[PDB]
Amino acid sequence: GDVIEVGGAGQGGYG
């Protein structure tokens, strides 16, 4: 049983 997660990635600006 190999539980895995990830973490969100919010990225950017004027571009």
Interface with a copy of itself by CB under 8 A: which residues? 1-15
Alpha carbon distance 4, 2 (integer Å): 6
The least CB distance from residue 1 to a copy of itself, in Å, is 5
Q: Give the whole-angstrom CA distance, residue 4 versus residue 13.
A: 30
Nearest distance from residue 6's CB to a copy of itself, in Å?
4
CB of 15 to a copy of itself, least distance (A): 5
Separation of alpha carbons 10 and 6, rounded Å: 13
